[PDB]
Short mmCIF file of C-alpha atoms and ligand atoms in Angstrom, two decimals:
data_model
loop_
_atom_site.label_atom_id
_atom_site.label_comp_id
_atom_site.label_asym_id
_atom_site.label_seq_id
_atom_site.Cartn_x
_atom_site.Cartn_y
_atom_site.Cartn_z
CA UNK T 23 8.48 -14.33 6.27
CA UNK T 24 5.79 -11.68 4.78
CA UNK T 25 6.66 -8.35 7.06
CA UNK T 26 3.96 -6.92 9.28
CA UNK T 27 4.48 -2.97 10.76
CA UNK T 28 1.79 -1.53 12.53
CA UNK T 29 1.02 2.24 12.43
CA UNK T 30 -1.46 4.47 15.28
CA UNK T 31 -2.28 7.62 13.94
CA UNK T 32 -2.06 10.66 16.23
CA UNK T 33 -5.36 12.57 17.51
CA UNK T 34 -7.07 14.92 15.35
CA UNK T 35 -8.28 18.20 16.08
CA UNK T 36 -11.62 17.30 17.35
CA UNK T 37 -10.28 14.37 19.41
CA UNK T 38 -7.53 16.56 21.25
CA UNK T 39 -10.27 19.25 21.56
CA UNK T 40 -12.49 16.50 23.66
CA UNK T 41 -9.50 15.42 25.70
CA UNK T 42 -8.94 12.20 24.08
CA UNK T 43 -7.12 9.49 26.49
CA UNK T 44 -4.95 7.31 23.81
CA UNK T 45 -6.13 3.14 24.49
CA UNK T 46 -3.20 2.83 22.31
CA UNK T 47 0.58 2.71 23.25
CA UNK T 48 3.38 1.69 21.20
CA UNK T 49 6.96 0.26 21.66
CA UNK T 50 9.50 0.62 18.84
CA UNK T 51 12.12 -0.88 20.70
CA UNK T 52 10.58 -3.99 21.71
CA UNK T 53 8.08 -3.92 18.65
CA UNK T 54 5.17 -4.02 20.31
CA UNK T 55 1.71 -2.64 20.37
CA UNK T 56 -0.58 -2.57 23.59
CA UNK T 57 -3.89 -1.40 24.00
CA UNK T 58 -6.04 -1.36 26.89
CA UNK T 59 -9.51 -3.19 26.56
CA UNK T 60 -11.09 -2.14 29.63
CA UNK T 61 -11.95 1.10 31.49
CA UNK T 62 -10.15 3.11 33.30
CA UNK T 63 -6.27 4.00 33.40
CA UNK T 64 -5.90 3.86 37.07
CA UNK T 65 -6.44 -0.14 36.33
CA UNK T 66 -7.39 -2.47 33.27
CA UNK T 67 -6.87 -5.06 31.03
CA UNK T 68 -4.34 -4.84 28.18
CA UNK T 69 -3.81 -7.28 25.09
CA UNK T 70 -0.22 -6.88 23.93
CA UNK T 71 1.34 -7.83 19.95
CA UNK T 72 4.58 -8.30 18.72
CA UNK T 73 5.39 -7.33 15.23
CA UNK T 74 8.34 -6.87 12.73
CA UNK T 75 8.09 -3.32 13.32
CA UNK T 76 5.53 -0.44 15.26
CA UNK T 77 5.45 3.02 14.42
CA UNK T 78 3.42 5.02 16.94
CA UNK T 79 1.62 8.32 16.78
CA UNK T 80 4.52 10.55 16.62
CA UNK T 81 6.22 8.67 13.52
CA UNK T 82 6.84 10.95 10.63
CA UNK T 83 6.15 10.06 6.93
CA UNK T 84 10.13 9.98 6.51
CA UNK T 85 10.39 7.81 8.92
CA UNK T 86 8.16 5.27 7.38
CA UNK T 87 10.25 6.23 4.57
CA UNK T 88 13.39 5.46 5.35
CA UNK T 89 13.12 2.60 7.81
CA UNK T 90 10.34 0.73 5.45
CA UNK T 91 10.17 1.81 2.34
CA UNK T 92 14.05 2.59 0.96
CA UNK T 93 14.91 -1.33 1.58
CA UNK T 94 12.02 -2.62 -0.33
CA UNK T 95 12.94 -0.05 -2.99
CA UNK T 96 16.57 -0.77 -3.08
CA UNK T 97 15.62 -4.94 -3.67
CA UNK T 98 13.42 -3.54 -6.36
CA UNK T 99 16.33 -1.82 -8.08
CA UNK T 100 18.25 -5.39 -7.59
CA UNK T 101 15.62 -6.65 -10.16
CA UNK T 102 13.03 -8.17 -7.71
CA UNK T 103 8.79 -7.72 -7.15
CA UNK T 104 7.89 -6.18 -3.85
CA UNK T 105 4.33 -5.83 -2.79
CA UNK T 106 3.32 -3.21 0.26
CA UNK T 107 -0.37 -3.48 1.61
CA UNK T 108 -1.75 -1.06 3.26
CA UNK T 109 -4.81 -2.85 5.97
CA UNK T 110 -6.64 -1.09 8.05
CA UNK T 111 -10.56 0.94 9.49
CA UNK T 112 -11.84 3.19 7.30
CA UNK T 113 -10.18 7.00 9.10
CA UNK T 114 -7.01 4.88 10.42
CA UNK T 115 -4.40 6.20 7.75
CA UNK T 116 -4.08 3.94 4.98
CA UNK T 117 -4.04 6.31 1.97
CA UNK T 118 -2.30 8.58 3.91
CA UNK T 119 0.65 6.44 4.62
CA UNK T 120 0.55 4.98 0.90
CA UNK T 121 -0.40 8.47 -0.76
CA UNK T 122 -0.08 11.13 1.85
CA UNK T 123 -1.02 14.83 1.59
CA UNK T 124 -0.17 18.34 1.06
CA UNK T 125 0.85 20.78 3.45
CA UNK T 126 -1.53 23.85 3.58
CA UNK T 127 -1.27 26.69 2.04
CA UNK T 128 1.14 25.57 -0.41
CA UNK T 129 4.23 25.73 1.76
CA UNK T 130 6.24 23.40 -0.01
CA UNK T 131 7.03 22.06 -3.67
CA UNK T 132 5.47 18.07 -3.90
CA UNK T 133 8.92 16.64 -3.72
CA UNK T 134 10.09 18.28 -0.42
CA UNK T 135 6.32 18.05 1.15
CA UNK T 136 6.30 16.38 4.12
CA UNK T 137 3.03 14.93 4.42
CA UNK T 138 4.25 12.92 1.16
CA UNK T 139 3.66 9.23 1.35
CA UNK T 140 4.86 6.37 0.16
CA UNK T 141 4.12 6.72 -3.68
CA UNK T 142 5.52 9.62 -4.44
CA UNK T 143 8.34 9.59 -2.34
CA UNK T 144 9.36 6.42 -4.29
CA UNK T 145 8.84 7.73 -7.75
CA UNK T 146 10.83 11.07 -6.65
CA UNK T 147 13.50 8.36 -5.30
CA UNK T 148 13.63 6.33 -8.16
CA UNK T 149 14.57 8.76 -10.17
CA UNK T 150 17.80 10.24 -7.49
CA UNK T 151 19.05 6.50 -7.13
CA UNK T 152 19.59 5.63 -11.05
CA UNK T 153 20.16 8.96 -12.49
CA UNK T 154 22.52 9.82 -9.42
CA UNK T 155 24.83 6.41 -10.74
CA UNK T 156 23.88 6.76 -14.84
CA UNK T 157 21.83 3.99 -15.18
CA UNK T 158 19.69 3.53 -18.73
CA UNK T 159 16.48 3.13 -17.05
CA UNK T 160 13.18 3.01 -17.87
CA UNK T 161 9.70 3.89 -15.04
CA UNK T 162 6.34 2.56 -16.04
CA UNK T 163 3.27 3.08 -13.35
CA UNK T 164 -0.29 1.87 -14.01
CA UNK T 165 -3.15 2.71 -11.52
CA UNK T 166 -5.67 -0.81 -11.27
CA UNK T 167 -8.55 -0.45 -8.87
CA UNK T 168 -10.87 -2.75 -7.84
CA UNK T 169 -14.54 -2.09 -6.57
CA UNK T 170 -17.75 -4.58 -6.39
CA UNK T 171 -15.22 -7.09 -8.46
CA UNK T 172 -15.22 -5.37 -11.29
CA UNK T 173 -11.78 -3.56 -12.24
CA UNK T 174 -10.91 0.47 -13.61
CA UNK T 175 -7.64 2.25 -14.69
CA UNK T 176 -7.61 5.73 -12.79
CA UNK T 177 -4.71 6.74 -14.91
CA UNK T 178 -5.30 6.72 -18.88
CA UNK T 179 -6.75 9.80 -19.90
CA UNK T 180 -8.58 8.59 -22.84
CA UNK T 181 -11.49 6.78 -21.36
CA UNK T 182 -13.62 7.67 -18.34
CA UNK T 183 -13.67 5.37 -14.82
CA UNK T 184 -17.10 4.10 -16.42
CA UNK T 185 -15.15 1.75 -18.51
CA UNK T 186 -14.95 -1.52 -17.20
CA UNK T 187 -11.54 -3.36 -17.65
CA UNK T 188 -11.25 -7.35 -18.37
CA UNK T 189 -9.14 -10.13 -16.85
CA UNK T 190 -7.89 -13.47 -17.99
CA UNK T 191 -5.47 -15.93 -17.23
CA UNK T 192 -2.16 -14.98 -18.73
CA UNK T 193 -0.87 -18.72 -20.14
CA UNK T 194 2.19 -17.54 -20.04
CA UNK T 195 3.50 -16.99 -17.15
CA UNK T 196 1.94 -19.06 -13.84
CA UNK T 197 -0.48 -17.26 -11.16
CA UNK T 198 0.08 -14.32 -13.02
CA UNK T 199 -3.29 -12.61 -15.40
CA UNK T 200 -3.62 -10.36 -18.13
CA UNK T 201 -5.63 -7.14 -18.08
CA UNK T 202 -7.08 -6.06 -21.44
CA UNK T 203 -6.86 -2.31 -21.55
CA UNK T 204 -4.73 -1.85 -18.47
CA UNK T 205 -3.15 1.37 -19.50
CA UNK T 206 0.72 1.55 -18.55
CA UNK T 207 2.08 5.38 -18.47
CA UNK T 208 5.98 6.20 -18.72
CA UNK T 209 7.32 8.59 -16.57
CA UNK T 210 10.24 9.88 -18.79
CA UNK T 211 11.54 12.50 -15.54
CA UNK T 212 10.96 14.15 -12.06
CA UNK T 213 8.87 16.58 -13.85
CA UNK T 214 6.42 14.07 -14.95
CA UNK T 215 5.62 11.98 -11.93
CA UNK T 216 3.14 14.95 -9.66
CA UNK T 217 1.50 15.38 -13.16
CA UNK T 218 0.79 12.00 -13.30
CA UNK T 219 -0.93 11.65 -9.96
CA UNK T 220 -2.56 15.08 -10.36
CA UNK T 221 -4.91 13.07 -13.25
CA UNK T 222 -5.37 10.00 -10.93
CA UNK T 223 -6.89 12.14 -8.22
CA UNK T 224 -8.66 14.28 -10.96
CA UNK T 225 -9.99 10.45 -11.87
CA UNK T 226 -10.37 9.41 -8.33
CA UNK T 227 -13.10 12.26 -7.88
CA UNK T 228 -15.08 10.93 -10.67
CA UNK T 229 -14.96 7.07 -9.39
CA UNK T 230 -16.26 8.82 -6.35
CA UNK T 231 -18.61 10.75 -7.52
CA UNK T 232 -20.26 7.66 -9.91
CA UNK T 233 -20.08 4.78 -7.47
CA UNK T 234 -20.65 4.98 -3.31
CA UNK T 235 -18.05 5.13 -0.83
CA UNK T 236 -15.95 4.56 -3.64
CA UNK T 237 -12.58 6.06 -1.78
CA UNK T 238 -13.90 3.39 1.60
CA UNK T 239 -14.75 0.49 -0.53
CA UNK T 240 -12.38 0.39 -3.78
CA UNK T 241 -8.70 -1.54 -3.90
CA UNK T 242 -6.16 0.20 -5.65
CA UNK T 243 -2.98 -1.52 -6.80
CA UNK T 244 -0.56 1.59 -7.99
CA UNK T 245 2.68 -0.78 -9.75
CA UNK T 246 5.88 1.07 -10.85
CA UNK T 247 7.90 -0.78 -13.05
CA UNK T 248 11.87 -0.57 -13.45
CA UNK T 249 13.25 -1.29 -16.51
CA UNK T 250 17.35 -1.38 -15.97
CA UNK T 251 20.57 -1.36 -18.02
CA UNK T 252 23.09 -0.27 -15.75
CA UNK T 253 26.34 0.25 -17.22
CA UNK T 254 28.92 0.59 -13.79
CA UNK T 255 32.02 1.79 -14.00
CA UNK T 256 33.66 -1.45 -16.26
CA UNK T 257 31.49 -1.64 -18.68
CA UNK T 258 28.97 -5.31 -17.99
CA UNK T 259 25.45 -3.94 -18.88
CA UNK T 260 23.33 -5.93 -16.42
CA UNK T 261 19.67 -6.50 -17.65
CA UNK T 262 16.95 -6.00 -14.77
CA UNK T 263 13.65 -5.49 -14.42
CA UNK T 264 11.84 -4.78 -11.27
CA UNK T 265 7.89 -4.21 -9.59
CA UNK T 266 6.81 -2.40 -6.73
CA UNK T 267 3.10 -2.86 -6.35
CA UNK T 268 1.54 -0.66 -3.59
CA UNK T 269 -1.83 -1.33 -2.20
CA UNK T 270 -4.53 0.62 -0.25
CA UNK T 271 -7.08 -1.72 0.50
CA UNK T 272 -10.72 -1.07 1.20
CA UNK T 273 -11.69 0.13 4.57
CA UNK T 274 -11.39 -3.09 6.61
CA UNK T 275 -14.66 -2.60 9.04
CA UNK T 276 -17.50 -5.06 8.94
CA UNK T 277 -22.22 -4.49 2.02
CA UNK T 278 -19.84 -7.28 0.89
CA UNK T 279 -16.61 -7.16 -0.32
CA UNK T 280 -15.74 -10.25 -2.34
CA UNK T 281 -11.87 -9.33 -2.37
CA UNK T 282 -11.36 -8.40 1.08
CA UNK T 283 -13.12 -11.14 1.98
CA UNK T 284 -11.10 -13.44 -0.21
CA UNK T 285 -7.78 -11.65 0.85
CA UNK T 286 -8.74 -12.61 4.62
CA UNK T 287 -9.44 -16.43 3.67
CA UNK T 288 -6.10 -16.47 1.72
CA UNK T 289 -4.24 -15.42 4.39
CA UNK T 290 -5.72 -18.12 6.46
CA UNK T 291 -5.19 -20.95 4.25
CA UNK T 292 -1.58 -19.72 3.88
CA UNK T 293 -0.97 -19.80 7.57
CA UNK T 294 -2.39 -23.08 8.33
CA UNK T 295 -0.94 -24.79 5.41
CA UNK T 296 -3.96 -25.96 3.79
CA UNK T 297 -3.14 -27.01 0.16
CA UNK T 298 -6.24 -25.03 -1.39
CA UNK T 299 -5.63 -21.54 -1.25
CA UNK T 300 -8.95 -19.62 -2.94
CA UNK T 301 -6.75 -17.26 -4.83
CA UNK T 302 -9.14 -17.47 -7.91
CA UNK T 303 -11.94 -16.43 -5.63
CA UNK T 304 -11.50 -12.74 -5.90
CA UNK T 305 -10.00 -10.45 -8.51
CA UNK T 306 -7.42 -8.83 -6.08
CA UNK T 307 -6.08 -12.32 -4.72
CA UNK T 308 -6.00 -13.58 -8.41
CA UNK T 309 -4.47 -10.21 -9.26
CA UNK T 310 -1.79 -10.21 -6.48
CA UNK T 311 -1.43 -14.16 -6.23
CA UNK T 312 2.73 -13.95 -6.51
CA UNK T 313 1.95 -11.69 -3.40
CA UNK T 314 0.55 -13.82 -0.80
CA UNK T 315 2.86 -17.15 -1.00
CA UNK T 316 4.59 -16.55 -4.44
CA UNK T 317 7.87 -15.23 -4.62
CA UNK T 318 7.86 -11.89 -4.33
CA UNK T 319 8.59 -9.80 -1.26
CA UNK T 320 5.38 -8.42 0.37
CA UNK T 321 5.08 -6.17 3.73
CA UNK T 322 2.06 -5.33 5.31
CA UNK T 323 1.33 -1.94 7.25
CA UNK T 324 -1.71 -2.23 9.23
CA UNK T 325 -2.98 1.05 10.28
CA UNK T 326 -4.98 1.59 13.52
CA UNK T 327 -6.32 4.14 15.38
CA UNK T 328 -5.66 5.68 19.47
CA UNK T 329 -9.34 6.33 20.01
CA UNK T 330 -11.33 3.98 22.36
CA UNK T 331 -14.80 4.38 20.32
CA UNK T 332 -12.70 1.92 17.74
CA UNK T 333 -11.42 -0.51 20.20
CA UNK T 334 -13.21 -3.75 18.50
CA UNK T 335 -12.14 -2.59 15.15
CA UNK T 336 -8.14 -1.89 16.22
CA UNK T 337 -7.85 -5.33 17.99
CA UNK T 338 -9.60 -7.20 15.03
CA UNK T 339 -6.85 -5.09 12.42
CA UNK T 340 -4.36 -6.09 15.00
CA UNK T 341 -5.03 -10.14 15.11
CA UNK T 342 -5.40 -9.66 11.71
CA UNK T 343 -2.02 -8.08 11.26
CA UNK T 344 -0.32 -10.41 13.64
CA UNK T 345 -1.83 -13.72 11.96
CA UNK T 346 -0.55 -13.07 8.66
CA UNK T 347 3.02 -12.87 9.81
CA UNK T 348 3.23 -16.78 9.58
CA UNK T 349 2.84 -16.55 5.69
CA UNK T 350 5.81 -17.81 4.03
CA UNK T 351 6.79 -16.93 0.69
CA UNK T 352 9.71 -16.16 -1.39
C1 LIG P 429 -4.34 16.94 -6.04
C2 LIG P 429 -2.90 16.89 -6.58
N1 LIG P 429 -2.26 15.58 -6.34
C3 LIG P 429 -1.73 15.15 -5.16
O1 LIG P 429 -1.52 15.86 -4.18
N2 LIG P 429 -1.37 13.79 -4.98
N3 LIG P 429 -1.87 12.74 -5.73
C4 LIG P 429 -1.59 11.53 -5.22
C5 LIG P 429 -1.86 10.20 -5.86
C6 LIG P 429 -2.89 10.08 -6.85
C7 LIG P 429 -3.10 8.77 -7.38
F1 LIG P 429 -4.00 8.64 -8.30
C8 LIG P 429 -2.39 7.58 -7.00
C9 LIG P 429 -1.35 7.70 -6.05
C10 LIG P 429 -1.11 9.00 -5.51
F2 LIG P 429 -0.11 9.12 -4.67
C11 LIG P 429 -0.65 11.82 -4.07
C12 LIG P 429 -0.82 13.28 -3.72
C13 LIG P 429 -1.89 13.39 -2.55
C14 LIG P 429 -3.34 12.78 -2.81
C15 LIG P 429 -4.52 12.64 -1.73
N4 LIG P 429 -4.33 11.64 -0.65
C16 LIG P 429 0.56 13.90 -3.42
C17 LIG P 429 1.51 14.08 -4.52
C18 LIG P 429 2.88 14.57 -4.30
C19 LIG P 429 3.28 14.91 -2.95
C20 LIG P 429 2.35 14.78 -1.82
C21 LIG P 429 0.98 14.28 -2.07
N1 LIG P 430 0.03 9.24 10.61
C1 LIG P 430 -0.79 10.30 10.56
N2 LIG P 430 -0.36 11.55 10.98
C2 LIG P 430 -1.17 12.66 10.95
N3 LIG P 430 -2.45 12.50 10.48
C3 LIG P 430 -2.93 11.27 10.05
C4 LIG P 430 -2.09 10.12 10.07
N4 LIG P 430 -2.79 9.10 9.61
C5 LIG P 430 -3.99 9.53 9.30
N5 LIG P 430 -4.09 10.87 9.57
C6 LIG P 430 -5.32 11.70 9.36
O1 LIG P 430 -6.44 10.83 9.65
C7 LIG P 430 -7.52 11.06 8.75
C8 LIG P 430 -7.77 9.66 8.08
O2 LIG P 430 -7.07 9.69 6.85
P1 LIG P 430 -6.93 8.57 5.75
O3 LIG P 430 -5.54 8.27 5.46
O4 LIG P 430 -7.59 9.12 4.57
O5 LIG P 430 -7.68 7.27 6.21
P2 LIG P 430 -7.97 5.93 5.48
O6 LIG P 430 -7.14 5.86 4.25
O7 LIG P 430 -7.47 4.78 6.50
O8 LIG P 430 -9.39 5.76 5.20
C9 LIG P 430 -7.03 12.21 7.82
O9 LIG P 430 -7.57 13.48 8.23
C10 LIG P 430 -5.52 12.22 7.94
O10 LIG P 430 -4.98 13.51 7.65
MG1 LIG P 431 -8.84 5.86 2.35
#
């Protein structure tokens, strides 16, 4: 049931530059992935996978747009939770597919960019879907990140990523936890959304700066919640609130990571029905526990890389990946 799309990112400059020979090839159409495990491409071994979905090299952000994110928006806007992680090596694409970049030399405006991922396409979206169909609405983001199991806010401006955030068991609510201080920002318009994210990176460099490998080892959890009145064309002002949490995890290569760790053992409790699931065993599974077997709607893109010098680490991403499609949970 939980979605799995896999994504190979192109060559860089230095890898086309030493005439790079891809051990990576993707199928759309028959959603597969196959990469060769042995020398030579005269003759070799190949280990094929079959996934929901496989984007390869050549795949545009819009495309990952369009064919995975709009649906999981529009059941968003239907007054649902949707979850998207983001798994994959360290240099393999995950913040870029979740975040994306600028193009150079400031050739475009941040909402026509397109090297824009995921997040801002969607608050840019959000914002054309209900406006475009007057809708009272209401967009709330908050910016959670996890590193060495302790949790920071890279989005309220009043306190620096120094400050330590606290979680406890929301008694409300099942599988579900409360963070004290989690700061949640409104984005009133358009406008206001690039500002936003202009302070998270501005944040993001300190974090960086004050703890190591913070951008390879941290787990950030970016939610954007819908508040909805929409008031159609009779006049039946349907109440709806929806959550889209996206997720770059840490860099999944194998000191110790107590969440990606636990994420990995939830996933295989999950898939081999075992009653005890160790969600309480890390602060992102307790965090994202209605993700992984709850009811909302999660997808996973697992991001790998064409280069042979990562073969072991784009075949363990890949069983990865193709395990967790057997999770069931809605
Ligand atoms: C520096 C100014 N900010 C900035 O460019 N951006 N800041 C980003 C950003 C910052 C966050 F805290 C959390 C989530 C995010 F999405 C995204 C990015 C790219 C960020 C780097 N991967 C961007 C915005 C709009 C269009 C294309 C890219
Ligand atoms: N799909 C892609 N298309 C073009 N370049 C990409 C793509 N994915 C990753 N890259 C490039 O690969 C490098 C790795 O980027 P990044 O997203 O930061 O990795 P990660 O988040 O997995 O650690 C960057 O220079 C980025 O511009
Ligand atoms: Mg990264």
């Amino acid at each position: 049931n939980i979605q799995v799309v896999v994504r190979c990112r192109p060559f860089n400059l230095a890898e086309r530059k030493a005439s790079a020979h891809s051990i990576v090839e993707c199928d759309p159409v028959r959603k597969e992935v196959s990469v060769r495990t042995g020398g030579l491409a005269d003759k070799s071994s190949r280990k094929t996978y079959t996934f929901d979905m496989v984007f390869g090299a050549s795949t545009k952000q819009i495309d990952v747009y369009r064919s995975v994110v709009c649906p999981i928006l529009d059941e968003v806007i239907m007054g649902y939770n949707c979850t998207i992680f983001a798994y994959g090596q360290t240099g393999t694409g995950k913040t870029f597919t979740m975040e994306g970049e600028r193009s150079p030399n400031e050739e475009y405006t941040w909402e026509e960019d397109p090297l824009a991922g995921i997040i801002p396409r969607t608050l840019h979206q959000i914002f054309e879907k209900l406006t475009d169909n007057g809708t009272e609405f209401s967009v709330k983001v908050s910016l959670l990140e996890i590193y060495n199991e302790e949790l920071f806010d890279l989005l309220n401006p009043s306190s620096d990523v120094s400050e330590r955030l606290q979680m406890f068991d929301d008694p409300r609510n099942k599988r579900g936890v409360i963070i004290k201080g989690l700061e949640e920002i409104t984005v009133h318009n358009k406008d206001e959304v690039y500002q936003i994210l202009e302070k998270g990176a501005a944040k993001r460099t300190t974090a960086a700066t004050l703890m190591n490998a913070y951008s390879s080892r941290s787990h950030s959890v970016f939610s954007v919640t819908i508040h909805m009145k929409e008031t159609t064309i009779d006049g039946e002002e349907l109440v709806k609130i929806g959550k889209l949490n996206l997720v770059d995890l840490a860099g999944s290569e194998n000191n110790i990571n107590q969440s990606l760790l636990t994420l990995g053992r939830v996933i295989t409790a999950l898939v081999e029905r075992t009653p005890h699931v160790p969600y309480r065993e890390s602060k992102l599974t307790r965090i994202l526990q209605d993700s992984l077997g709850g009811r909302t709607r999660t997808s996973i893109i697992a991001t790998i890389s064409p280069a042979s010098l990562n073969l072991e680490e784009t075949l363990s991403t890949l069983e990865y990946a193709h395990r967790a499609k057997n999770i069931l949970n809605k």
